[PDB]
Design a protein around this ligand. Structure first.
Ligand SMILES: CC(=O)N[C@@H]1[C@@H](O)[C@H](O[C@@H]2O[C@H](CO)[C@@H](O)[C@H](O)[C@H]2NC(C)=O)[C@@H](CO)O[C@@H]1O
Ligand SMILES: [Cl-]
Ligand SMILES: [Cl-]
Ligand SMILES: [Cl-]
Ligand SMILES: [Cl-]
Ligand SMILES: [Cl-]
Ligand code: NA
Ligand code: NA
Length: 129
């Protein structure tokens, strides 16, 4: 599924990401935008052979199991394919673990490089939330 911006904002809000670990909702929407262009089916292969999955491009090196990232962890205890669902629950729940892990949203490269320190509230501007 390719979410609309506000649709995703609302879904993320419903799933408790607004101000989760202090990260306002726009951070999460910004991250999703630049990680996946709001596409739940996005996958990208990393240089180490892991793959990033889903709307928040959660990687299989640490967070999910895709059966082809040897030596990796599965800290969200999910098949990576679950992160490709049109239902963002699994991604959100995993993202909550990630962002809780001490590094905040810096785990999301695109967030660090494209959202952090920007006016992320712009990403939820105009949305009914
Ligand atoms: C939370 C999450 O999974 N974020 C992704 C990053 O992990 C990806 O970065 C890449 O992650 C792999 C596995 O840890 C690293 O080996 C790789 O070096 C790292 N790539 C970079 C450029 O840092 C990122 C890839 O675009 O996608 C999400 O942000
Ligand atoms: Cl868009
Ligand atoms: Cl915000
Ligand atoms: Cl694996
Ligand atoms: Cl959802
Ligand atoms: Cl933080
Ligand atoms: Na990425
Ligand atoms: Na894994």
């Amino acid at each position: 599924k390719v979410f609309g911006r506000c649709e995703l904002a609302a879904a993320m809000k419903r799933h408790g990401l607004d101000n989760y670990r202090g990260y306002s909702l726009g951070n999460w929407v910004c991250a999703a935008k630049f990680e996946s262009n709001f596409n739940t089916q996005a996958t990208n292969r990393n240089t180490d052979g892991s793959t990033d999955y889903g709307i928040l491009q959660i990687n299989s090196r640490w967070w999910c199991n895709d059966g082809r990232t040897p030596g990796s962890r599965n800290l969200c205890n999910i098949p990576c394919s679950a992160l490709l669902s049109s239902d963002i629950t699994a991604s959100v729940n995993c993202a909550k673990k990630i962002v809780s892990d001490g590094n905040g949203m810096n785990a999301w490269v695109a967030w660090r490089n494209r959202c952090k320190g920007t006016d992320v509230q712009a990403w939820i501007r105009g949305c009914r939330l």
